Structure formats: structure tokens, C-alpha cells
Amino acid sequence: SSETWRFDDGASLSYDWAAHRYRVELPSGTVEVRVGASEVRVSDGAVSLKAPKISLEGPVEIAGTLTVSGDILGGGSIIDTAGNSNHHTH
Amino acid sequence: SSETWRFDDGASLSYDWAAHRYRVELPSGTVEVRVGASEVRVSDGAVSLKAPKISLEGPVEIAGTLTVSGDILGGGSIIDTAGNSNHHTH
Amino acid sequence: SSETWRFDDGASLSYDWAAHRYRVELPSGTVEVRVGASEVRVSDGAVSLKAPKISLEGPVEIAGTLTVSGDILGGGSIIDTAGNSNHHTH
Numbered sequence A, B, C: 001s002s003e004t005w006r007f008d009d010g011a012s013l014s015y016d017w018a019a020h021r022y023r024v025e026l027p028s029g030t031v032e033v034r035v036g037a038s039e040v041r042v043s044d045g046a047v048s049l050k051a052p053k054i055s056l057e058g059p060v061e062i063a064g065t066l067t068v069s070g071d072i073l074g075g076g077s078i079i080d081t082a083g084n085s086n087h088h089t090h
């Protein structure tokens, strides 16, 4: 169903024609693509996106906790399940 | 302005020197880059980032609805347009 | 510690075996990967993800301000530091 090439570095490339799935895998290290001042980096510890604007076009689902250093501005409702702040007055 | 290579799989590579734009395109399937336990995957149904930390460095603009399974913690204001919860007490 | 290849376009590829770090760099332009209707694009002005679903699996840390055009739905608490709306009633 698939084939794999293993490189001298331990990295591999695999291609499953029964899925059209291409996989590049490194056991450890960092892969980075930079264009101007924008970067996508994939490393053992993180996936990092850095750019003048990071645009996510579609429904976004975070499986985890979201921490934002700056403000959070929503064009609709902002609805919790377990608690929000009383940092406002009626 | 550009040139294109079409592969036997239906995939293509194109390069516009009048924009310095490189495009790799697959009609269907999955492309994945894995480094350690971190992954970026692009498939017909999703773009998926999986990592011990997902770092977005810059202004983030979501064109869509954001769902977070865990908590949302903001270092500044969290301001809606259309409604927030009363899950707090004055 | 590393080696670099510089292309006729000003782009470069570098590999540090003392880090297993691969870097592709373009001074200016756009690099795009498309699979079906999903895309990851890296350009001078932005990193853009577009897909039927954008899945972020792990803790997400935004260093910047987050703007969401649609709703924000949290499965836990949503806690600010500096202010939230009074768009609700007790």
C-alpha cells in the first residue's frame, strides 16, 4: 500500500498511493520555512507560526487550553462553560 | 509569468517568477511533516497542528468560529459583540 | 556546524547537523501547499491556514492580540486580566 525511503540521518519519506498520503518524518530537530519576516517552524517542542498577520480561515478547534498575551476581541458571542470574570459593572 | 509541472499523480508544482510564488498542489490526500512528537498535516478535510506547544507569534485573525476544549486565558481584555456569560457574581 | 546552498533566486537551504535543523528561506514571495480545498501559505505579509477545519491539538499560546469574526466557545473558564463585557444580565 505504501513505500518508504529512509535517509542516513534517520529521517524518512513515505508515500501511500492508497491514500495519497505523503509523510516526511524527522526523529528530532527542526524544520523551518521562512518567507520575508514570516516563518513556520516544526520542532520537537513546538509548532511555531510567526508573521505580521496569522490568518486562520475556517472553523478553529483547539484541543487544549488557549493563552493570549494581548486582547481577545470577538465579533459575536463569547461563551464559557465553567466561569468568567466579573471585570465589568452593571 | 509562471510555469507548471504536472506529475503522474495529478499533483502539480508551479512557480511564478513575477511574484516569487511557489505552489505545490494535490487534488486529494494528505501531506504531513513530523518532527519528534510535533506534526503539521494538510489534508482534504483539515489543516492540523499537533505539538507540545503551538506558538502563534503575531496578531491572530480567525475568520470563523473558535471552539476551545480547555480554558481561555487572556492577558488583557476579552470583549464580545453579541453576548457573554453571567458565570460570575458581583 | 552547518552548510548552506544559495540558489539563483536569492533563496537558500541550510542544514545544521549539530541541531538537525533544516531551513528553507526566501527573501520575498509566497510558498503555498494546497491539498483539496485546504491550504497553508507563507508569504511576506502573513502565514495563512485555510481549511474546512483548522485543528490545533495542544496548548496554544498567542503572543499578540486575537480577533475572531465569529463566536468564541470555551469548554472551561474564560478569564481576562483587564476587562470583559457586561453583555449579560444577573
Ligand SMILES: [Fe+3]
Binding pocket: A086, A088, A090, B086, B088, B090, C086, C088, C090
Ligand atoms: Fe456580570
